[PDB]
């Protein structure tokens, strides 16, 4: 009964496409013609954090906007002090290749994972004074790509076996799973209200999942190639998505279609990380052109270039109060901007 | 109180500069292959025995080496291959399923996809053609699978620049060098000249497979160090 089911499925995406096309009355570029633009954004490198031995793959700001944790492929994970350029902890890892890096909102735990399919969580504030591993998670058969802390007992993960999954830190088992992707999931971004997250994969799809329910809410398909980058707007009602089309695309959750395309003719290289500002006006995107562009989110014009890295920017992070932008790249340096 | 935190940061940076000389003295080797290929004989003879990956930190000739085999993965290998840009070599293990889709054709398309990668443009491939005892035991049975399964074998001759082993049947030499220039056609079909291929006719229990990868890895860092000053 595959012939009737594929025709019913194609009529269902035709119904979804007609309902998406019926609800587009105006354009976001048309409605933002009363906004005075920001002009040129000038950012200078305030702190240059050196000390990593190899290529920095992932990074995560703390919630107090002073602590900072970065991962690298040499096999050691370094807790940073951003104001004084100090190193608080240096955590050696079992596996050399870590592609994700997470920091708890309470600051007590740091999780990381990579090609060994193990999400290792490390206890920072224990009594013995040394950073030891809390519990290894061993349920994914594919390579780990992204992880974000929800609580100190819950953590959602992205992996390369077409599966996202929630976790229990105390129990050690999967509370729920997310098995709706057809390609390798590379990133996820959490909501401010924490009950939703959206994850993009290699089949140019971003699925909005439900954390409590365990199902997929919406499907966003606007990109032409893989997706390496995803981020939520401050309010949690929209998200911007970076991919290998040299094109960032803004998707809205409520209208459930594509809002605005961020692209230029001169850029041919893909987007690795995206992050918003506190207001949501500035959208900063890493590239393989050895810099980071500051896109205005409502006007889609180049408002600034953070060009200080000698190699490819893998990760990007802005603080919770929006005070600083920290970019890490493949030349073992993580620079904190203005 | 801030000065002791600064001193702790200086101890952490001196610990990092202790491990920095450990890190740049180690050569990173990526192991690639399949389950048909011979890698259960590498675990007995090149000191793998002392998780989705199987790292091996081991030494020969007082030179640090570090091999890493990625286990069961998917067909779209384009996303975890960007993590291996800093390696010096790619160790490719091919078995011998010929004269016994296809396993050798899947290995040929795997070498085609790995060799023409964007992230592996400056990284050469060391090629191991394992299970050479199976290219001579089933020759005398006379099934002739390499003539049925490959139409280019009838127009292929033993090369004049090749160095065969004496005291051996020439059909075994044809069955060796047919796969050897089959795999060399993909390497010489690029023409960029930035990275090359090193074929070897290993058998599973060969105790010289470490010196082979030692001499070929010496050849890759000699390639880079002579290109740096425009000498090649």
């Amino acid at each position, epitope marked *: 009964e595959l012939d009737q089911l594929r025709q019913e499925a194609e009529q269902l995406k035709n119904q979804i496409r007609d309902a998406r096309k019926a609800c587009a009355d105006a354009t976001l570029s048309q409605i933002t013609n009363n906004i005075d633009p920001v002009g040129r954004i000038q950012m200078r490198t305030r702190r240059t954090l050196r000390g990593h031995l190899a290529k920095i793959y992932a990074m995560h700001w703390g919630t107090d906007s002073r*602590l900072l944790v970065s991962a690298s492929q040499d096999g050691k994970l370094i807790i940073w002090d951003s104001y*004084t350029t100090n190193k608080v902890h240096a955590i050696p890892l079992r596996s050399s290749w870590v592609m994700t890096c997470a920091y708890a909102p309470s*600051g007590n735990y740091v999780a990381c994972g990579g090609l060994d399919n193990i999400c290792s969580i490390y206890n920072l504030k224990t009594r*013995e004074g040394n950073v030891r591993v809390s519990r290894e998670l061993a349920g994914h058969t594919g390579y780990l790509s992204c992880c974000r802390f929800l609580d100190d007992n819950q953590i959602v993960t992205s992996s390369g076996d077409t599966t996202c999954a929630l976790w229990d830190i105390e129990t050690g088992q999967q509370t729920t799973t997310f098995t709706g992707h057809t390609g390798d999931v590379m990133s996820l971004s959490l909501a401010p209200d924490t009950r939703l997250f959206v994850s993009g994969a290699c089949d140019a799809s971003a699925k909005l999942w439900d954390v409590r329910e365990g199902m997929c809410r919406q499907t966003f398909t606007g990109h032409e190639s893989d997706i390496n980058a995803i981020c939520f707007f401050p309010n949690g009602n929209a998200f911007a998505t970076g991919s290998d089309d040299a094109t960032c695309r803004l998707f809205d959750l409520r209208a459930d279609q594509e809002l605005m395309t961020y692209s230029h003719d001169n850029i041919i290289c893909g987007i690795t990380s995206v992050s918003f500002s506190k207001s949501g006006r500035l959208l900063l995107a890493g590239y393989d052109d050895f810099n980071c562009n500051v896109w205005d989110a409502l006007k889609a014009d180049r408002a600034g270039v953070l060009a200080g890295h000698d190699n490819r920017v893998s990760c990007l992070g802005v603080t919770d109060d929006g005070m600083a932008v920290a970019t890490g790249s493949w030349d073992s340096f993580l620079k904190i901007w203005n | *109180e801030d000065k*002791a935190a600064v001193e702790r940061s200086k101890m952490i940076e001196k610990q990092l500069q202790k491990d920095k000389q450990v890190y740049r003295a180690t050569h990173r080797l990526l192991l690639l292959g399949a389950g048909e290929s011979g890698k259960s004989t590498i675990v007995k003879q090149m000191r793998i025995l002392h998780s989705g990956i199987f790292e091996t930190k081991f030494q020969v000739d007082k030179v640090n080496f570090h091999m890493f085999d990625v286990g069961g993965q998917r067909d779209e290998r384009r996303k975890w291959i960007q993590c291996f840009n800093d390696v010096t070599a790619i160790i490719f293990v091919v078995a011998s399923s010929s004269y016994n889709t296809n396993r050798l054709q899947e290995a040929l398309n795997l070498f085609k996809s790995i060799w023409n990668n964007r992230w592996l443009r400056t990284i050469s491939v060391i090629l191991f053609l394992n299970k050479q005892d199976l290219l001579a035991e089933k020759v005398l049975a006379g099934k002739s699978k390499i003539e049925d399964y490959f139409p280019e074998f009838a127009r292929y001759t033993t090369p004049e620049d090749a160095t065969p082993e004496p005291g051996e049947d020439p059909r075994v030499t044809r069955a060796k060098y047919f796969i050897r220039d089959e795999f060399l056609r993909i390497s010489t079909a690029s023409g960029d000249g930035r990275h090359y291929c090193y074929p070897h006719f290993t058998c599973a229990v060969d105790t010289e497979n470490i010196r082979r990868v030692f001499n070929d890895c010496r050849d890759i860092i000699q390639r880079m160090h002579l290109r740096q000053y425009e000498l090649l």
Partner: single-chain antibody
Amino acid sequence: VQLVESGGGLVQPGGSRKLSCSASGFAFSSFGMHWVRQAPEKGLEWVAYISSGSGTIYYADTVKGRFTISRDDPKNTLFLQMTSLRSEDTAMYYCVRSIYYYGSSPFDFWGQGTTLTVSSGSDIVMTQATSSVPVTPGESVSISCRSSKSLLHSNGNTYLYWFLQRPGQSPQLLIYRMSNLASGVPDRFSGSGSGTAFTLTISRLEAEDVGVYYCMQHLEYPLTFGAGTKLEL
């Protein structure tokens, strides 16, 4: 976590006997170490300190020129050479464990203490006004302390530590950097104040909160403690 001291006893004046603190239950090489002594009739005072990795060594004004403090990181053992011992040096010597990074909790663990008895033959003062306060369980007594200069540094961090010394027990840490509570301390103590005046407020006091309360500044070295406020039922 266990710090056990040894090498104490009766000491002739002008003699020498070396104290030894043994560390167990924690990684000794990443923790700064202190020796803090207490008179049999007076309060605590600070003697010496080595940072982690044997980098810097500090002493007090009536301490330097006579003593020598040393560590042993594989053997996990503190040492304190005690030469030219005088009649004012009869005290109970505590082995003190501390760490220093941002957001750390120094002075969290204290030793049991060894007794060394000597026989016969600028600077910041801390003024604790009340010496004895007669308390009742449930009265919620708040006690205060004063400093000679403003302890609030230029980075926004003020430096004041609080202790509770039970009869027969070590002065365990309650509050570090005037606001923060230590690990294992219940949420009954709170501290606040300006850079000069400080107050420690207890709410809903039980029978386990009796003892002597002490301060410490980390504006600079040497470390001064104060008089002490005793709570009596």
